[PDB]
Amino acid sequence: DMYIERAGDITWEKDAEVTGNSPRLDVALDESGDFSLVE
Amino acid sequence: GETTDGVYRVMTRRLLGSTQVGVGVMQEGVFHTMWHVTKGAALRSGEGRLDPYWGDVKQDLVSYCGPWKLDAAWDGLSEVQLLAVPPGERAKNIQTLPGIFKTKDGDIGAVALDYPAGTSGSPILDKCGRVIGLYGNGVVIKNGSYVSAITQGKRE
Ligand SMILES: CN(C)Cc1cc(/C=N/c2cc(Cl)cc(C(=O)NC(C)(C)CO)c2)ccc1O
């Protein structure tokens, strides 16, 4: 059985850590909601 | 129970100890998460209960106690902010310029940040602090990193 806990507020944080890339990917989306890489 | 706006953890005691299966957004008294997190099951908040209202396995989204309320969209230009709620760890804002999923049915934003599956349902935010979608449906790339679709719903 499942329960929820308030883990924080939702705001934009000025000077958050900035990281990751921005890849452009060809994907499919199946009936089960699974994304997969099209190549 | 608790009905306050904000980001929440989704926990279960069905496994060893207290395990975090995912994360969601309380807004306008409605709780928003991803279908895979709850599989549409009821939720406890104190001695308050939350029943499912809307859900779609292909959108991988579910709302509780009312219809889907988040409508804001990625502009396609700006760095967003994810609000990562990782298991056992404090909420942390990570800034990233999204990538794109190109699909045979139009383009959607994508976020290339590594977090464990329990972070599933952690929200993504625009510069006014609006939830433009939810993080934790997506795909593994060559690297072995994670790239989530930015998943968002429709408001009636
Ligand atoms: C319709 N399916 C596809 C929905 C579905 C989704 C998931 C969640 N998948 C995730 C979500 C996150 Cl946020 C992260 C990760 C991950 O692996 N990240 C790493 C950095 C690589 C750590 O290992 C997986 C699970 C089962 C399901 O049915």
Which uninterrupted H or E stretch holds A7? strand A2-8
First-residue to last-residue Cα distance in chain A:
40
What CATH architecture does domain B80-151 belong to?
Answer: Beta Barrel (2.40)
* Gap between the Cα atoms of B102 and B112, Å rounded: 15
End-to-end CA distance of chain B: 27
Provide the pairing of β-strand B61-64 with B80-84: unpaired
Contact check, Cβ <8 Å, A23/B6: no
Q: What is the dihedral of CA B37, B86, B94, A32, to 10 degrees?
A: -20
CA of B36 to the centre of ligand 1 (A): 9
Closest alpha carbon to B68 in B120, B33, B39: B33
Residue range(s) occupied by CATH 2.40.10.120 in chain B: 6-64
Instruction: Report the length, in residues, of chain B.
Output: 156
Q: Which of B9, B28, B47 to mutate to test the interface with A (most CBs of A within 10 A)?
A: B9
Which residues contact residue B71 at a Cβ distance below 8 angstroms, ignoring those fewer than 6 apart? Answer: B154, B155
Contact, A25 vs A39, CB < 8 A? no
Architecture of domain B6-64: Beta Barrel (2.40)
Instruction: Give the pairing type, strands B146-151 and A17-18.
Output: unpaired
Delimit the CATH 2.40.10.10 region(s) of chain B: 80-151
Task: State the method.
Answer: X-ray
User: Do residue A2 and residue B112 have CB atoms under 8 angstroms apart?
Assistant: no
- Nearest neighbour of A20 by CB, restricted to B112, B126, B127: B112
Kindly identify which residue of chain A lies nearest to residue B36, measuring between CA atoms.
A33
